[model samples]
Target: DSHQLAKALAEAADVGAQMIKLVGLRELSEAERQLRSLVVALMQEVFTEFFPGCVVHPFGSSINSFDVHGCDLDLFLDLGAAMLELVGSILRGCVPGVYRVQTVPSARRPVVKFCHRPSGLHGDVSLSNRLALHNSRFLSLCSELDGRVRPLVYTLRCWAQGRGLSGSGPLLSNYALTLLVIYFLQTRDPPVLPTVSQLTQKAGEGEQVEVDGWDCSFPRDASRLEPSINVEPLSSLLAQFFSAVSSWDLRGSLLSLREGQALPVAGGLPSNLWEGLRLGPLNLQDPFDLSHNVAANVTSRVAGRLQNCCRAAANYCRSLQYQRRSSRGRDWGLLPLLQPSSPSSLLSATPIPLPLAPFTQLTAALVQVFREALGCHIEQSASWRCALWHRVWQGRRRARRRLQQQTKEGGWLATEAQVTQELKGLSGGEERPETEPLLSFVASVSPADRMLTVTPLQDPQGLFPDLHHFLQVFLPQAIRHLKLE
Candidate 1:
């Protein structure tokens, strides 16, 4: 039995090397290419053999080329109920003999964590028997609330960037934003994010889908464990992504105004944007650390806006639902928002703010948990590091300026102590003019004006082509025109 386990492990290592050879980048050198490919492939095979039938998918910077020296593989291991049982049976059958496997059991289920040296491939296997059978595919979708929360975050990031907020580097990394969104969503009463399986199960099952003339294409049976990606609609994924940053907070706030109540505007978060908290050799940084460069209440100010917008979305959804019901005269089958079971608990906790300064500490702590629990090293590239700092100093300054301008009439409703703390944190920086305003310069150019054509760099991975393209299409207009404050 133990010998069989050893055989599987060795086979997995060999299989992994083959995968790397096939998928490894073309530009990789003969020596390093072999080394990296073998490592990645070995890890993949070991994990797969260790827990067969579970779909393992890798995402984020590694595939996109945003990886740095110590970048950890971000893998999602999906296991069904039957496969979970085998995990224990298999591990039990092959321990302390030819090879070894680490099986960590839990109250709910268990995790089959896999690792390899030299190759440095690691996997954080998730044990989940419940899967969503959609149109012929096995799928996992984030919960609606978390889905909504994620887009809202990106929207705010967009707003910050468009107003010439982020400094002259790459904007916020995808990983940073992801961590923040997860935190905000988890804290929501009816958490926003839905796991992939949940989204699939609730798809066509909803009356709203029928009314909207949208039919889900996911399968209903266990014919094929994994569904075809081609048949599956990308709408839900895009729906989770349709976001605008420029006025996201303002929009959510305005929607909430219909409820006629002020929302929570602050939580325990760092006020200083420049101070990087240390966790071992890693530094916890924030993109919206503007208090150092500007005089303003960064946390409360942004939180107020986010509160208003969330309220607005909720109130608007309610009104629209009521109108639909009134017109239909009966239950026409509109999907209802999932309400939290414990309403009091949901309503009691203080809401998180939308800015970077507040989420930095919370997200940092969350990240550390993942590192220890899952053996993941979510990294920040050098370029990304520089760009994040830029956003803190400049991007936040733009938002701070706009916020102050809006508050000129009666000022914020913040208490004297709150105001004092904000001032004390940011005002300690150089006593620069607080009234510094963002200036936009757009000029008409003649046909004969020096023509400059830009060519993409040889290695385009580090530059993040997709995000760059996104910024080009969306910024400098819709969000840039917003009045900051």
Candidate 2:
């Protein structure tokens, strides 16, 4: 009996080691390779059952050393249309306890995502199906740019850490730094920077925007920055980009609190301080752990702020009258060339050796009036407004799915009763409550009636009550915002 138990244990250990070696090939190196391999293999085995055709490829800095020691793996789940439906059914039926699917809203199509993978020793996996090839390039570029100026981002975090800001205190990650760059670009007038798709035109320009230096290129060939991939210098202009983004006075208590810096909402930084600042009703119960969210009320508050920002940004993008400026003047088109006191300042933007063609067409034409026009071919992409709207549409689709699920479980009576009660309750207490009061009222009316009466239940303080209210409000507003159906 003792010999048999020993034999079984040896066989299990051998299988685990072999599995690790296969999945952890690029990820695990040096010593942890042995253990991480087994974990990766186990996950792959799980994927094979749940997500049939989807392949998990590591996207983030884990492939590059720009990773901060224990960074999670950003995994893209490539599932074709057929595979998507198949995986959805399988996950719904089988992988119940293991994976939780969350939807990442996209404008064109809603994407289903597994929010988190099993916790691993190295980093966890964030799996999503809606992968943008262009945004992926942009993300790669952000990492490259951030990788170059990591010293500054790390310094800021360390400074906060030193101040007893808690090991997980109010701080910004290099990822946040990337968002800062995008937000600053969004604020620029006429938007000098093209969309990621536009920038992806020229091989070198794509290289500049996506990878800065010769880091990860399109085909993923032999294009890593070396002697060591970790210490490559990002493009000079991109370097200046980070410099300008980080100069924000976010560390100030008033500024940080106003921007909701301590909150877990996405893109919570306050760029324009002149604008009124606000935070959600979320009160962090314990500063140390953030695993639990604030409260349900917090969601409504956060959603309110998001809605307001979207409206404001949408209005601004639509209203702003953009006039092309003279490049010969101090400013270069819409981008303000920062004048740093010291040339050594990372924020300083000297005239890049890159030709004007790569930046602004109007500037290039003006340069042509002179001798030879300096230029690099630049591609133009859609506005950030369009991109953001696209994300919102994706989110709505996910919400629609959940609504459908509720309808299914409750049955037809549940829905009819709900609507009837809602109608009566919404009419207010001043109105008399009667037996089958709503049903009798409905029956008296023509069954073929197109008329739908709206009565406000609670003064949402100018907010939609629930999903139905949101749909009633959103569908029309979104169409009107874009001037479409």
Candidate 3:
């Protein structure tokens, strides 16, 4: 599994350069641009026919630099619900190839979701979402502010998709992810990008503007902004980013890229402002409308998943696998980080080797046990690589309970501390061993490679049952020792 997934990720990381290139709208091919532009024009023409003074505005990734290939075209209309009501009917009946014309007028922010079959371009036409236009422009400004911002955003976006964190439902959308990147850059040492407030302060009188009662002013001239002194490579920045967000207090504070720092809920804001702020697992404030939380839709469960993934990524970044390329075609660098076997897959700097045993029959037998009992695939070679594609040890809590029961029933011969001491004595002072091993065996779990290596006892041939028993005993101890929180 690791071999194949790693190869896919390697190919993805290689092609991802071209992804970022084609992702942005600036370099969109002539045919692609025509289709995109025509979709907007056609929507505008349809709306103008119903409401004589109405206009259409393209916003979000379609116009912003964060666009990916085949991204949805988000447009805002200068019209009311009354105008939209008429426009929707006209579009469904008259607009050729505009099928699946769904009107969601009762939504929090109402819009018409449609697809143009001729152009193969899908889009959303919102009647009252002018704020999106302002925010989109702000995102574009951030892209222009620093060369590093776009790449970081693209890379992280790719990571999110691979790690199952990208969506419009309970997870983060591209818009929210882009804002997170901008916020990260804004808070970085030397600040590769400026906050919206800073941008607003720098705006000249001629450039000052307001929309929907919010001060939407920002300097459009990138030449006027100070150049970033952060010379860190993209890889380092990515590593730092994962490390930072992994432990960040998302629940206790509000993330405001406009403010350039997390605004603490306690004593940091006025009491009146707290009531207006929407508290959630991930609180990301909208640049224009500070009251709106961009990440409000994310549930606590999803947020936990996000944080766990970040922690895994942070640890992976520090590993030799992430920094140095493997000469033997192993999965290394950002490629592996994106295609992690599980969200909870831990990262160890070095893969633990099966001590003092040949990497042949023992490893093969071990692989068979793993495949049968745990559904894990261990590569049969000298490398002794074990790829855990899913969660194998699920009974840790149950095992802990069973241990407690054994002690209560007086079956345990010693206290947990005494057992730990005896186990330590048995293993003889090795750092981070796999199991509290019995029968003179050494085992270790290598999270970075999602692998397990086992060296057998002296009587290795008839020890299958002992090895199996060792696993049943080792799982709980290993979980306890790992400290995965």
Off by over 4 Å in 1: 1-40, 43-56, 64-66, 77-114, 127-247, 250-485
- Model 1 worst lDDT run, 10 consecutive residues: 381-390
Best candidate according to TM-score: 3
Error of 3 at 144 (Å): 0.5
Per residue, candidate 1 scores C-alpha lDDT tens digits across 245-362 of: 1223321221111111212223222343224322111111221221111212123323343334334434534454422333322221111221111222221111211122223333
- Ordering by lDDT: 3, 2, 1
After superposition, candidate 2 runs with Cα above 4 Å error: 1-29, 32-38, 60-65, 80-147, 150-153, 156-174, 181-198, 204-485
lDDT of 2 by residue, 1-485 (tens): 22332232223322222122212322345544343344445556667766687565555444433344344545545544455555444544554333565443431234444433444343323334223333344444433533333332332222222222112112223333333344334233333222333333333533432221212223222243221223322222233333433343322212121122333334443343213234333222111112212121223322333233324323322332212323233322111211112211111111112112222332323222111110111122111100000111113344445556667998232332233333333332234434122111000101121111222222222221232243245333332332331
- Count residue pairs with overlapping backbones in model 2: 10
The lDDT per prediction is 0.30, 0.31, 0.66
For candidate 2, what is the TM-score? Answer: 0.29
The window of 10 residues in a row where model 3 has the poorest summed lDDT is 343-352
CA lDDT of 20 in candidate 1? Answer: 26
TM-score of each: 0.23, 0.29, 0.66
Q: Lowest summed-lDDT stretch of 10 residues in model 2?
A: 382-391
